[PDB]
């Protein structure tokens, strides 16, 4: 994708993450744990479903028969009708192919974006109490227990409390 996270600097996805689209997986004194981020998952879901509702609709435009399947119309008028119908088919076949391709490009980039937005949010929270691993992970200098990890996930992590100890451990 354009934002270089999904199939980018993140190696791969997690098949264990059945909770949501995006999430956190930590390591600390208590061990490893994994959880989903609601806000990011929901923002991507809402945007995709909004594409669907827009495309999955049929027009109220009525068309009638202009030829006949049991009693062939005159040949000249019949050939004009067929030529016109085939010309229209060619237009819609193009429109459909182009619509889905461009939507699909945007949908993949959109998901890539949301991952990046989540990654950047977390970096901005930690404020010199952590550094970038480069594989989509943050090495934390100070000791961050399960209580501490949850605070990061819930946006309640106060960087100033752990600053001095993390700073020193540089």
């Amino acid at each position: 994708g354009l934002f270089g996270a999904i199939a980018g600097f993140i190696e791969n996805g997690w098949e264990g993450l059945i909770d949501g689209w995006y999430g956190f997986r930590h390591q600390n004194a208590q061990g490893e744990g994994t959880a989903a981020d609601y806000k990011s998952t929901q923002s991507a879901i809402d945007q995709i479903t909004g594409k669907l509702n827009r495309l999955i609709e049929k027009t109220n435009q009525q068309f009638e028969l202009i030829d006949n399947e049991f009693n062939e119309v005159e040949k000249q008028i019949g050939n004009v009708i067929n030529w016109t119908r085939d010309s229209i088919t060619e237009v819609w076949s193009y429109n459909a192919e182009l619509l889905v391709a461009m939507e699909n490009q945007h949908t993949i980039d959109l998901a890539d974006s949301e991952m990046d937005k989540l990654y950047e949010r977390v970096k901005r929270q930690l404020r010199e109490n952590a550094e970038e691993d480069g594989t989509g992970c943050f090495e934390i200098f100070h000791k961050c227990d399960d209580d501490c990890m949850a605070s990061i996930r819930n946006n309640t992590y106060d960087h100033s409390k752990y600053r001095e100890e993390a700073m020193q451990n540089r």
């Binding site: 996805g13 993450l17 930590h26 495309l55 076949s93 993949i108």
Partner: protein, 316 residues
């Protein structure tokens, strides 16, 4: 010591196309092109007239197979392959235009023209139109000469449309099997028939001669028609060989017409129809039938076009 960010994934994704790439796998996707047909005419909630053995144009003239359709009323009109517009061999001039008018008519209401006749016969019948013995088109009258070889007097009958909507008028021209049999029925000489409305101007000389036997008969009847506007008058000058209208038809409102070989079903609802059935779908496209009618998804040539509804799948 750390906290990692990630996203969900599957062992196997669903392939889709993009601007850049063919067959990239994503977590979830959905179809945009409808392939599912329902093999019935879904007519729930709709006034439906299945014509069966009655041809649509026969509703106006009235061969025996159309006796129960002379004044039908409908939202949906279904034509069948077994339908016939005629009993006595013949066809309509400008036939498909008339079909198109009647398909969206909402059906027809009938009213007497008011023609009365003196110095001729009006009760001509045939074995091809069977109503417990020989009969004729219910809405028409076969105008003859009083007796064999007797002259047919140059006649002028008129009819003004005194209603608010245009009147559908149909008349016929009988071409007999021979030059002799025309003189027998209508007397010798060159027979002429003329027709004049504000919009319309035409004439009709007959042409007897041998045709192949249809229904056992080698004669033919041409059927002709025009739409007579409100307060407009139409006149018929004829020397013979003329099948006179008894009633005029008026259009009731709105309908749609289809052609089909499948059964009606009042348990399902649909607005998109083809000869093989009904397309029930909210997808924007369909690959079932390019001649489908009603309110339909757009026809496309591709069988399938999958829309990504998930991120790119990047498995372990």
């Amino acid at each position: 010591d750390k906290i990692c960010l990630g996203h969900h994934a599957l062992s196997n994704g669903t392939k889709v196309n993009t601007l850049t790439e063919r067959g990239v796998e994503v977590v979830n996707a959905t179809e945009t092109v409808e392939r599912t047909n329902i093999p019935r005419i879904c007519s729930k909630g709709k006034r439906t007239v299945d014509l069966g053995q009655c041809g649509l144009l026969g509703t106006i003239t009235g061969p025996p197979q159309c006796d129960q359709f002379l004044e039908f009323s409908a939202d949906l009109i279904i034509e069948r392959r077994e339908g016939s517009d005629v009993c006595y061999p013949g066809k309509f001039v400008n036939e498909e235009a008339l079909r198109q008018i009647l398909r969206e008519s909402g059906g027809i209401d009938k009213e007497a023209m008011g023609f009365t006749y003196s110095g001729i016969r009006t009760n001509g019948t045939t074995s091809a139109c069977r109503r417990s013995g020989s009969s004729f088109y219910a809405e028409m009258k076969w105008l003859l000469s009083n007796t064999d070889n007797a002259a047919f007097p140059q006649m002028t009958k008129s009819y003004k449309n005194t209603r608010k909507s245009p009147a559908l008028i149909v008349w016929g021209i009988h071409h007999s099997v021979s030059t002799a049999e025309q003189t027998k029925l209508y007397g010798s000489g060159n027979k002429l028939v003329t027709v004049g409305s504000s919009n319309y101007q035409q004439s009709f000389v007959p042409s007897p001669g041998a045709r192949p036997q249809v229904n056992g008969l080698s004669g033919r009847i041409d059927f002709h028609w025009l739409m007579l506007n409100p307060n407009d008058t139409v006149t018929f000058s004829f020397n013979g060989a003329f099948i006179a209208p008894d009633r005029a038809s008026f259009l009731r409102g709105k309908s749609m017409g289809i052609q089909s070989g499948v059964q009606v079903d009042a348990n399902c609802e649909g607005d998109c129809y083809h000869s093989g059935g009904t397309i029930i779908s909210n997808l924007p496209f369909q690959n079932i039938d390019s001649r489908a009618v009603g309110k339909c998804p757009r026809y496309v040539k591709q069988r399938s076009l999958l829309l990504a509804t998930g991120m790119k799948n990047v498995p372990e």
